[PDB]
Amino acid sequence: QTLFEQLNSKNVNDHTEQKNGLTYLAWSYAHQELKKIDPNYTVKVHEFPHPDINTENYFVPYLATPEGYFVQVSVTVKDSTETEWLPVLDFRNKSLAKGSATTFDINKAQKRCFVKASALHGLGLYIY
Amino acid sequence: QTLFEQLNSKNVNDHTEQKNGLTYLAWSYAHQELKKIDPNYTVKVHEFPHPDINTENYFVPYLATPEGYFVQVSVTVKDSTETEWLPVLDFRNKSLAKGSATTFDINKAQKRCFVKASALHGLGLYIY
Amino acid sequence: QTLFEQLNSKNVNDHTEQKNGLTYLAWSYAHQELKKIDPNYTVKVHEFPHPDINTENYFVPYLATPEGYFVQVSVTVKDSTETEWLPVLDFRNKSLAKGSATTFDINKAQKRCFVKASALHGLGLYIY
Amino acid sequence: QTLFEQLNSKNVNDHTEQKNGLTYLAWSYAHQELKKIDPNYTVKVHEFPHPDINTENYFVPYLATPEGYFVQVSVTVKDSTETEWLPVLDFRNKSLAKGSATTFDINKAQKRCFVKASALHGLGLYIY
Amino acid sequence: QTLFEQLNSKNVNDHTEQKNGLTYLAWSYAHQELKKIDPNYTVKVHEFPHPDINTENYFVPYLATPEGYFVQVSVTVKDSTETEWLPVLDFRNKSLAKGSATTFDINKAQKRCFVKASALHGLGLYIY
């Protein structure tokens, strides 16, 4: 068949967490399923220059913008790349203004952006 | 036949949400239908220099203008590219002035601009 | 025959909205009719430097002038290009002074300029 | 015969509006008559540097002079170009001083300058 | 015979207006008579740098001098060019000082300078 249809036709319902009334598939499950399909696949978290620090060659792993925070994750399986963006959010799914976000929030957003970019491939597309 | 007519003759009415009295087709449905027609298609969100931050090589994913906010999405299916613009808007469909928009608003506008650019292709043109 | 006469001899009266006592043909209808005649046609919205912001490589999609706002749309069907200009206007068809226009107004003016440039081709010339 | 005589010998009286006691032929009629004679003809609205704004590569579609406003339209039919100038005027046909003209006034003057330049060709010369 | 004698021996008395006790032949009549004699003839309105505005590449269509206003028109029929100058004047045929002239006055002076330059050719020389 094809990668999209094979991956799309799977049930990731069992490995999900209901937090805030939303459904999330854990990254651990996503990491193994793609690993099975393709043994060698790449996950890259983009790094962007920081607006406040002017030191040269200083690149943080997230985008800080005057309006908030952004993350980017690029998942490449079998020579196909799917990029994704996401806003960093609170535990209550509310936006975080400049200077109100901790490093633990960014890491959670980075992990969440990975499982969503994988959903651009057939796996668990129905949840999003 | 042709891509426009094939895509135009589909019913996307079932997968729609009535919010504020407007009809919207979910991106998830748009992502799969184009994926079926063409296995390898590209979605690109344009990035523009930011008016307030003067750091070099700093590119946000939206356009901030003294009059408001703009987003752009370019969808390429089978070597044909359809670009689209849209204003970032509130939950009540009202405009957001400079310094009043959160990152969650931009992401929603980005997703909405994707399904509208896909409607430039035959799919779900009737809604817009 | 010829493109002008074929396009000119059509009834776009059914797909019109009477707002403020003026007659407007919806863009959706214009997008499909030209798409039928020519499968591959281009719509380009011109981008102009902004008078107030001095950042380099900053190009907004409209013209802000000390006297008001202008938009431009270039529609190319079958290797023929028809450019058009229009003033951005209120819901009451009144002019908007510098600093009084929202991004929702510009987008409406951009869509309206598209259907008028298409009317430079035979389609719906009688309305304007 | 010749273009001037053919075009000159036409009755554009039916398609005229009596406003302020003057006679005007609508642009829509002018656009179709020249289109018939010549399928491919060009209309160009000249763009001039603006006296107040010093930004580079900033070109408005009208001429603002310390004494008032000017517009220019160049109509080319069958390899012959007829340029024309006109002052931007009020609804009462009075002059507009620097800083008193809206974008709606400029557009009306641009359309009027087009039908007058076409009158340099035989069509509707008698009105002016 | 010759262009001067042929053109000189015509009666333009019928197409004249008596304003302020002077006789003027309308431009419309002049435009058609030369058009008949020569199908392709050129009218050029000279453009001069403006004394007050220092912006580069800014050229108005008239000459503003500390003593008043001047216009120039060059009419070329059959490879012969006749230039002409004229002062911009009020409705009462009085001079206009720097900063007292509107764009409507300049346009009237431009049209009048055209019919006088044509009178350098035989047509209607007797009036001036």
Author numbering:
A (entry chain A), B (entry chain A), C (entry chain A), D (entry chain A), E (entry chain A): 4 to 131
The authors write:
To parasitize a phage, the SaPIs employ a transcriptional repressor, Stl, which in addition to repressing the SaPI genes, senses an active phage infection by binding to the phage-encoded anti-repressor protein. Here, we show that the phage satellite SaPI2, which does not encode orthodox anti-phage defense systems, provides antiviral immunity mediated by Stl2, the SaPI2-encoded transcriptional repressor. Stl2 targets and inhibits phage-encoded HRs, including Sak and Sak4, two HRs from the Rad52-like and Rad51-like superfamilies. Here we have focused on two recombinases, an annealase called Sak, and a recombinase called Sak4, belonging to the Rad52-like and Rad51-like superfamilies respectively.
We struggled to obtain a good quality cryo-EM map of full-length Sak80α. The full-length dataset presented two major challenges: severe particle orientation preference and the absence of the flexible CTD, which is a common issue with Rad52-like annealases. Consequently, we decided to focus on a truncated version of Sak80α where its CTD was removed, Sak80α∆CTD. The data set of Sak80α∆CTD exhibited improved behavior. The 2D averages from this dataset revealed stable ringed structures of different sizes, with octadecamers being the predominant form, which was used for the final reconstruction. It shows the groove commonly seen in SSAPs to accommodate ssDNA in the outer surface of the torus, known as the ssDNA binding groove or ssDBG. Truncated version of each protein where their CTDs were removed (Sak80α∆CTD, SSB80α∆C7), proved that these two proteins coordinate their functions via their CTDs.
